[PDB]
């Protein structure tokens, strides 16, 4: 018999993104080629099957630095990290291939689905 | 020119609640009288003006245990902690006074607003 506040989840995600922009309580650096991205382990786990597996591992859960596969494009990762914290995906003709490949690697099934749909249309 | 996934914020919050239920990556214990509640500092900050102030403090940001004011009712806190992680508020005739008082202390303005509305109606 609970009541529900419709905007609560969106407001929580907006505040987590504000903490990220100000580098507050970030507990991991994701290294993609030369580029470094600070984030919250819990948010990465909540959005990605790959980060979920990494941070539930008894040894990896304690690492402050995670290095991604050298094939991963830093721009594709940046677009996906922004989507994790905002629900907004900057999908463009020039980045769609790098975004789909990065989403497949990160195991973000809903992003993979929209990339396949957008590629099929063109 | 981004696209948006409508269910993303709700799905993120659902996964954060799953991490909480399994005690994964919880980094703080909130002590309310004899009762202890494990949580994620980032989620508490995103939902509460009080936790936002506590964990942005250069000294308190590093504490693993936070003790609330002895006037705070553990049941009222538990109802509010569940709301933080689910958007669902278990508001009942028998708990509304303890829930409103705890929400005022935690600085959760939307919960305070619905409690005042429900009290006014009765």
């Amino acid at each position: 018999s609970c009541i529900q506040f419709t905007r609560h989840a969106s407001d929580v995600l907006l505040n987590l993104n504000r903490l990220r922009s100000r580098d507050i309580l970030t507990d991991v650096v994701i290294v993609v080629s030369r580029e470094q991205f600070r984030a919250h382990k819990t948010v990465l786990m909540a959005c990605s099957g790959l980060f979920y597996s990494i941070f539930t591992d008894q040894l990896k859960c304690n690492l402050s630095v995670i290095n991604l596969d050298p094939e991963i494009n830093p721009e594709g990762f940046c677009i996906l990290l922004d989507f994790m914290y905002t629900s907004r995906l900057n999908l463009r003709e020039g980045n769609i291939m790098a975004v789909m490949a990065t989403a497949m690697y990160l195991q973000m099934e809903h992003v993979v689905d929209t990339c396949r749909k957008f590629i099929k249309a063109s | 020119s981004c696209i948006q996934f409508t269910r993303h914020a709700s799905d993120v919050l659902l996964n954060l609640n799953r991490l909480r239920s399994r005690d994964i990556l919880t980094d703080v214990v909130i002590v309310v009288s004899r009762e202890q509640f494990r949580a994620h500092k980032t989620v508490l900050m995103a939902c509460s003006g009080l936790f936002y102030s506590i964990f942005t403090d250069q000294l308190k940001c590093n504490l693993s245990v936070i003790n609330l004011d002895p006037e705070i009712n553990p049941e009222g806190f538990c109802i509010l902690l569940d709301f933080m992680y689910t958007s669902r508020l278990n508001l009942r005739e028998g708990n509304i006074m303890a829930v409103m008082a705890t929400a005022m202390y935690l600085q959760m303005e939307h919960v305070v607003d619905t409690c005042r509305k429900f009290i006014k109606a009765s």
Binding site: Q4, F5, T6 | -
Partner: peptide
């Protein structure tokens, strides 16, 4: 607020 809504009835979920």
């Amino acid at each position: 607020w809504v009835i979920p």
